[PDB]
Amino acid sequence: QAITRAMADQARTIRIPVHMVEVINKLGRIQRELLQDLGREPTPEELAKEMDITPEKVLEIQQYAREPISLDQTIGDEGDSQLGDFIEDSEAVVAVDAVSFTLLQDQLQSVLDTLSEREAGVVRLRFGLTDGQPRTLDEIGQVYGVTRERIRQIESKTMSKLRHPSRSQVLRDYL
Amino acid sequence: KRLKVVAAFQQSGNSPMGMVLDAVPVIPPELRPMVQLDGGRFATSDLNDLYRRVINRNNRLKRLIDLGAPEIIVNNEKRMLQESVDALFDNGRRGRPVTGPGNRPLKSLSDLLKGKQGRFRQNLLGKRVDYSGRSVIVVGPQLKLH
Amino acid sequence: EVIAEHPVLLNRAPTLHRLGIQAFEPMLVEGKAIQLHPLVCEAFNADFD
Amino acid sequence: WLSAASFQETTRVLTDAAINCRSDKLNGLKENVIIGKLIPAGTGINRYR
Amino acid sequence: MLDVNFFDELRIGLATAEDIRQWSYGEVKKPETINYRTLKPEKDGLFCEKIFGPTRDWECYCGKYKRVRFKGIICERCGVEVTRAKVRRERMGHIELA
Amino acid sequence: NSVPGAPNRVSFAKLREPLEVPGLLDVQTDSFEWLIGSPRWRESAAERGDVNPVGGLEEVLYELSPIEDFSGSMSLSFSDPRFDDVKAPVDECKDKDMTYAAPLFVTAEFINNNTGEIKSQTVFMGDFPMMTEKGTFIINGTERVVVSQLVRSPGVYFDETIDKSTDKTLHSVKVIPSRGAWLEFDVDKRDTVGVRIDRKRRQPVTVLLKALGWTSEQIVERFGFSEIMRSTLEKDNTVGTDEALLDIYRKLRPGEPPTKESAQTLLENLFFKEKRYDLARVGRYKVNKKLGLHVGEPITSSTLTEEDVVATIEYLVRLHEGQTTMTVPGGVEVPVETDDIDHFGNRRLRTVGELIQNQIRVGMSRMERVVRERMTTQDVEAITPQTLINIRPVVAAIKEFFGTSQLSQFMDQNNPLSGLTHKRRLSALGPGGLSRERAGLEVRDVHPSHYGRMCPIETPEGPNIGLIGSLSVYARVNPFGFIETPYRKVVDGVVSDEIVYLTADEEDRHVVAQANSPIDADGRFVEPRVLVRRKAGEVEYVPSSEVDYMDVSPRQMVSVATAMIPFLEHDDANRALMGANMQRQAVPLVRSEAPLVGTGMELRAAIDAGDVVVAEESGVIEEVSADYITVMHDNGTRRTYRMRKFARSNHGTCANQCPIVDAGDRVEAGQVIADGPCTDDGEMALGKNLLVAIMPWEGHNYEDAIILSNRLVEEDVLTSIHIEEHEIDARDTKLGAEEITRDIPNISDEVLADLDERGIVRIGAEVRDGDILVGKVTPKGETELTPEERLLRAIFGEKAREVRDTSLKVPHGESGKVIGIRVFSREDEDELPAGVNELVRVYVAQKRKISDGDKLAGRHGNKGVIGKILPVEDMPFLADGTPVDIILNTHGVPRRMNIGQILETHLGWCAHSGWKVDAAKGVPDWAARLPDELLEAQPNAIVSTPVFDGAQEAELQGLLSCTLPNRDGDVLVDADGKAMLFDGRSGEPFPYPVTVGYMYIMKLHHLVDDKIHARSTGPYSMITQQPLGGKAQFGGQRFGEMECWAMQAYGAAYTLQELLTIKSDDTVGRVKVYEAIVKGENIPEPGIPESFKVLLKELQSLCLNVEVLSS
DNA sequence: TGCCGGAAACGGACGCGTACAGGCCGTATAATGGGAGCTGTCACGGATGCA
DNA sequence: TGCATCCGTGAGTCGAGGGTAATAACGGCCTGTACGCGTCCGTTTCCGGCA
Ligand SMILES: [Mg+2]
Ligand SMILES: [Zn+2]
């Protein structure tokens, strides 16, 4: 009991629950016995029938049972290169979209400045441009000493204005 | 030969007590990444296995100690921990190198520095560069020298 | 226009000595082969095989 | 110690440089390349830089 | 520490237990690496967020703080310092050998 | 001849050959058939050794069964291996990615000892992979070939060394077994013969003999002349068999309390029980031959024996004494001499049969272990062999051998020659073989025993020089694994026609003649003194009476690929090596015309390569088309052959198969019925025939640069078809399921024009770099968006589009049409890997022209890239206006020692023009030995000069003398072989004659489009932040240590800082420099490298306190 | 036509009743010291153990 | 003191390349985690009248 429990708990780099590893071994035993007494590799539906679970559960168990690889095995025919140097770091900066976003911010600041101070302020507060948190109509009305209906009217007229081609012909290619 | 290291220890404000280890440090996870490839396949960095062995043997030693175990078992577990730490710091330095699946020896911290595949000669002195190219070459007898 | 007057470097493995790296002025050409001046082949230890 | 470690016998160099509490000066030529600062040769010296 | 690239020396010395436990932000005491199902780092494991920082930029473990406004604060429930995700590259841990 | 549809290729061969070239795929086919137990191999072995015809599987099962418990109260046995029909055909397997296999069935018998009960059951061993008609394996769809391995045969090996200090010889011996321990009996600086066992040097032979049970009187009686051994007896200082066994135990087994019964059985277990010490049948045969124990006994009992050990010790002592012959008591006399490892009498060839047999054995060992383990735990009388046996270890061993093993190589197929030469390949490196780092210069040599068994020319020229070789044309493999070579035995100077196969030992024992020995057309030698190879490889002149063997034919020492080189005997060895290695990389063109001048090893090589359809049974062609041929047999039945139209080879080359017969022709069984990739009318064709000039032209053909006429581009003389495939799998995900559909997020309708309704592109729709091939979308999930993105989305009214776009885009630098789309699905019940719901393959083919930078090469290793493709007008042309096609350089011919190209050029011009020897007054003296129907030849006729017996220089001069005019009265090529060329650029004739002719050149697989690469900013590595490498990803060039040294030596600092900081590793520097370049600002100052930060963290993690200090 | 000013669903916080995920505990005839794979480089320097 | 033994280190350069051996299995319980309709804030149409 102790040896089986410890082996199940610390056998893999990715820890697996005791019941899950138990059913994994049960499925492996069932598959081996079926192959031995059938002569043909059985189908997941047949495995599900014999083990009395669902085929999607069988597929999930099979996906879970897989163990990872090492980033330092010589993948090539000769030994001069590991596996980790062939893997792209997706979390890095594209180094192009960064400058694209910077110039998009510059163009947005320009197109905002083409409007007047009131509209620029209300839209910036509404969409959270100068600050991370986007303010709501009630907050804008409280700041500017007017009602949320007036704020909504200003927002609607500004949104209508910004959709003109004179103000969208520069922002079209940024999406 | 002895006085070399003796004077080396004496002249500084260094203490030889640090030569024995009481708290093993853990390398930051990003330098030993656990990346998921396409299709859900994972791939360890081969240091996680050594760290797991260290942690498991330390915890088992703690459990044996506070449970109360015979000196034979306690000493065996202590030797286990010692050998695991030795393998983590330098695999294959003493005894059979610790190997994973496929009879491939594991890579230790000192293996990240030794040889041509080490950090120094592989990434500190020569690196892959950007704004570069590569192609076959032909003769340009109509060109000028510059 | 943007390439005119912009030196580039050529490298050949192995870089036996100092003259294994040299700087030239590029010119656009058709094909996909880096045309090389015949007089630097001795310095680069490069034949066209 | 950095140059010797990057050169050869890195384990033996480190285990005795650490014991001696050796402190590098980053005045050579390999150390500047390793740490990304300008080398003290050619256009890297204070006379021209 | 900040690495402004103004250096004059690089001293290597024999580290001690106090130095190691001062470097370490926390102690790892469980040999888990990743959760098999949710694919999130386990608590106190070899990839513990509480010790080594957050995997996602400005996002704690339980999601109680998910924006730049909560910067430099510690999640009282999860225990993850809400900061940049690159921090997982510079924090170290230590193991207290029995 | 001997081929019914063989084109009439007139030959220059002087002497007839008695033996034809054997089946070039025999080394694979016969080996695998011996493994199986096929009736063909069974009847062959019955013809040549019917004493015990046993297959590999039969041998494994016999040496395994019976399996007993510790108590020995119950047993299990295996018997009668038997195969089943293949589960799927070859083409279906290759298409649906299965493995070409067949079920395995065995008859397991379970026997009880105490009670007595037999249980016979039919057990399915596993799906055994099978070897096809061409000797190749198919694993997961792709075609693989397992190369034969060169390993030293187990046995005894004696050697002598010089101590260089006292200057006395120190003999030794290594009894190296397979699956066992080592033991050496050396001779020291003193006179104490050491018995180092398992690398534990002590304990002279007296103690070993006493442990074996030999008393001192017996030792002295058996060894009386041995002064060294009598001295060791005097200074033995150990008396008693039990005392010697005690010493043995304390020495070989430290840390174990010795007993008087454990030691008595330890030696027997270590060297006499077959469980732990089993030198193979080859080892037993080698030991028996070396010592001469049994001369007629059938080989069995593969374990060592005390008589063998004492014979080895006596052999060592007599060799040290300096004797010449030895007689074991009860055995025949045998000469005593040192043994060489590089001799091919000791380097056995472990072929595919033995390799797969070894893997089968190591799997069945695990299976038997599991059987024994579960055989005790499970209750008696309640078990059956089906419950006993576990076949998973066996099938896993087979699979893990076929995949992930460097002896199971990806079968390269650039041409049928490449495939054929990848078969018959002998590789010395592999599991159980020497590695490159341990490969000393001694093994990378052509030992004089390689003549006729391995090509001294063909071998890789890189770091693997000498470790990889190929079988000779006439070579044959012994059942033990030695390489035989046929010979014609000569008796009292009468060269008989009987062919006897000899190995290295027999060849060294006897005296061999020379292939081109001047026989008298009756059996005798015209001259008593003939060339002879002696035992030590010595070459001497010997009277004809002592000669007792002769080579079957010239060019026996050479391999196929090198035998395809005309005028080989005039070339050097390095350039012949280069030409042989670079004949296998030629790409298949779209026409593939036959070469003008060649050897006789093109038809046989092509038809034996398996890439040419050949009618198995004679008949008349009923229906012929571009897709199939129906041959109407002589008796009622018909048969249809399916051609392979534009099938992708493993290396991206066309594999077309065009029929070469009409609707009324009659074909005899064995005639070529359809061409292959690199074939013409049945024989081989790796290139085209091109007019050649040897003048240096304006520096464009400078230093192995090649000039081409634009006619090749215009008429597609050198134009290859390349097929690339793309694979994308729509798979299950945690957040949902990916689907293949037209609806791709944040995309326009312009790029969707070429996409059909279901997502994939149309068949025949051309594609360009950056297009969409398969439209796949992945559930993106919940992610916070930037406020600017929110503002833009609100402005433009576009929705969130919560799925991410990951579509199969054709990579950078590809074009061409789309041939076919093979799409798999889960709903139509196809065998897909778990987690994959949709798979689709797109085949893209491009018609690559010839262009500058492409690699061209002749058959003599005169390689060179294409410097410049001139127009037709500005190329030198002959007097009649025909322009030359290629322009080589004259400086490259002499210093490379390859005038074979010049001779080939002259002979090619003679063949193209046509000649007629004017025998008006007798046959001219220079053509006295010329064969008939060669004095006159039609224009554009083909000739065949063999390898080592071909056209002579005098005959070439005579042929060039008569060069009958093209259309008018004009002999464009003079007697010397040159011509008057006119400069097509200036106009004036060239002041001196220039050599011209028709050389045969081939287009190599080193195209420019596969090599050109560039990078500005791409993906980056994970641990370090440096860019990736290779053309597969984007990747950047490697700025190595030598380049850094050159950068430093240039007095340069800022360029080095740039290339090392803001181009590779500065994470917050690359974005800043890109922004500065885009905006037009100055380049900012760099920062410290992330790689250096990683190194600092690693050092801190190694318990090394590293602190960077400011002041 | 567009705008104004609310009005209609589509979505963040939930007690609740239920699903299951995972973990712990405990099994009674008897069984009581490993498989195991290796050992085809060559020169150099140096440390150690023993005659 | 000399001698042998042993250990450890370094022994090229550029593409082509990406997925694995080995078995008691259930009851009882238990606490935790989750998560599926409903009414609230809030945002995209609604439609009644209208300028
Ligand atoms: Mg070259
Ligand atoms: Zn939290």
DSSP annotation string for B79-105: HHHHHHHHHHHSTTSSSSPPB-GGGPB
State which approach was used to obtain the coordinates.
cryo-EM
For G40, which residue's CA is nearest its C1'?
Answer: F434
Distance of CA F901 to the CA centre of its chain: 27
**Do the Cβ atoms of E31 and A10 come within 8 Å?**
yes
Of all nucleotides in the shown strands, which has a C1' nearest the CA of F341? G40
CA nearest to F711, candidates F848, F594, F597, F850: F850
List Cβ neighbours of F646 (8 Å cut-off, separation of 6 or more). Answer: F654, F655, F656, F721, F723, F819, F845
F257-CA/G33-C1' distance, Å: 13
The C-alpha atoms of residue F704 and residue F891 are separated, in whole angstroms, by 9
F554-CA/H17-C1' distance, Å: 41
Other C-beta atoms within 10 Å of E62: how many? 12
CA nearest to F1054, candidates D44, B20, A49, E26: D44
Strands F864-870, F705-709: pairing is: parallel
CB F682 within 8 A of CB F661: no
For F167, how many CA atoms within 13 A lie in the half-sphere containing its CB?
Answer: 0
CB C22 within 8 A of CB C40: yes
Residues from chain B that touch C6, judged by Cβ atoms under 8 A, are none
The C-alpha atoms of residue F977 and residue F956 are separated, in whole angstroms, by 10
E86-CA/H35-C1' distance, Å: 34
CB F178 within 8 A of CB F155: no
Q: What is the C15 CA–ligand 1 centroid distance (Å)?
A: 14
CA nearest to F904, candidates F860, F962, F948: F860
The C-alpha atoms of residue F584 and residue F1037 are separated, in whole angstroms, by 29
Interface size B-D, in CB pairs within 8 Å, comes to 31
B62 touches chain D (CB under 8 A): no
A118-CA/H41-C1' distance, Å: 27
φ/ψ (deg, to 5) at F760: -80, 160
Instruction: Tell me which residue in B21, B29, B58 faces E52 most closely, judged by beta carbons.
Output: B29
The C-alpha atoms of residue F773 and residue F682 are separated, in whole angstroms, by 39
C-alpha to C-alpha distances, B108 to B86, F345, F1024, F1098, nearest whole angstrom: 9, 44, 17, 11
The C-alpha atoms of residue F731 and residue F826 are separated, in whole angstroms, by 10
Q: What is the E52 CA–ligand 2 centroid distance (Å)?
A: 14
The C-alpha atoms of residue E11 and residue A43 are separated, in whole angstroms, by 63
**Do the Cβ atoms of F1089 and D41 come within 8 Å?**
no
Torsion of CA F743, F746, F749, F755, to 10 degrees: -40
Q: Which of residues 36-65 of A touch E (CB under 8 A)?
A: 64
Q: Which nucleotides of H are covered by protein (CB under 7 A)?
A: 4-6, 8-26, 42-44
**Ligand of minimum distance to the alpha carbon of E59:** 2
CB F965 within 8 A of CB F546: no
CB B125 within 8 A of CB D30: yes
Burial A145-171 (b: 16+ CB within 10 A, else e): eeeeeebeebbeebeeebeeeeeeeeb
Instruction: List helix spans (H) across F919-952.
Output: none
Instruction: Tell me which residue in B9, B90, B125 faces D19 most closely, judged by beta carbons.
Output: B9
For chain B, state the CA radius of gyration.
Answer: 24
Instruction: List helix spans (H) across chain B.
Output: 2-11, 48-67, 71-89, 119
C-alpha to C-alpha distances, F892 to A85, F706, F867, F1053, nearest whole angstrom: 42, 11, 15, 41
Q: Which nucleotides of G are covered by protein (CB under 7 A)?
A: 2-6, 21-24, 26-27, 31, 33, 37-42, 47
The C-alpha atoms of residue F184 and residue F206 are separated, in whole angstroms, by 14
**Do the Cβ atoms of B120 and D19 come within 8 Å?**
no
Instruction: Tell me which residue in A37, A104, A132 faces F788 most closely, judged by beta carbons.
Output: A104
C-alpha to C-alpha distances, F54 to F109, F141, F280, F761, nearest whole angstrom: 20, 31, 15, 56
What one-character DSSP code corresponds to residue B124?
I
CB F673 within 8 A of CB F681: no
The amino acid sitting at F496 is: S
A92 touches chain E (CB under 8 A): no
Quick one: CA dihedral B80, B86, B91, B95, positive or negative? negative
E48 is in an annotated binding site: no
B27 touches chain E (CB under 8 A): yes
Residues from chain A that touch E35, judged by Cβ atoms under 8 A, are 15
Q: What is the F328 CA–ligand 1 centroid distance (Å)?
A: 60
The C-alpha atoms of residue F235 and residue F225 are separated, in whole angstroms, by 17
The C-alpha atoms of residue F991 and residue F981 are separated, in whole angstroms, by 9
The C-alpha atoms of residue F979 and residue A103 are separated, in whole angstroms, by 69
Helix (H, G, I), strand (E, B) or coil at F652: coil
The C-alpha atoms of residue F911 and residue B36 are separated, in whole angstroms, by 64
Residues from chain B that touch F867, judged by Cβ atoms under 8 A, are 138-139
D43 touches chain F (CB under 8 A): yes
**Ligand of minimum distance to the alpha carbon of E62:** 2
CA nearest to E42, candidates D2, B145, F11, B48: B48
List of chains touching C (3+ CB pairs within 8 A): B, F
**Nucleic strand H under 7 Å from the C-beta of F833:** yes
Q: How many helices (H) and strands (E) does chain F have?
A: 27, 51
The amino acid sitting at F505 is: D
Residues from chain F that touch E67, judged by Cβ atoms under 8 A, are 784
Min Cα distance E33 → chain F (Å) is 17
Residue with tokens 């015809």: F53
Min Cα distance A54 → chain B (Å) is 21
The amino acid sitting at F22 is: P
What one-character DSSP code corresponds to residue F249?
H
List Cβ neighbours of F115 (8 Å cut-off, separation of 6 or more). Answer: F381
> Which of E3, E11, E12 is best to mutate for the D interface (most D CBs within 10 A)?
E12
Shortest CA distance from F1070: residue in chain A: A95
Distance of CA F817 to the CA centre of its chain: 33
Instruction: Tell me which residue in F1103, F1106, F1107 faces E20 most closely, judged by beta carbons.
Output: F1103
φ/ψ (deg, to 5) at F1071: -65, -40
Other C-beta atoms within 10 Å of F679: how many? 29
φ/ψ (deg, to 5) at C11: -125, 145
The amino acid sitting at F932 is: D
**Do the Cβ atoms of E3 and F1107 come within 8 Å?**
no
Residue C33, burial from CB neighbour count under 10 angstroms (0-12, 13-18, 19+): buried
Structure tokens given for A89:
């770091």
CB F472 within 8 A of CB F558: yes
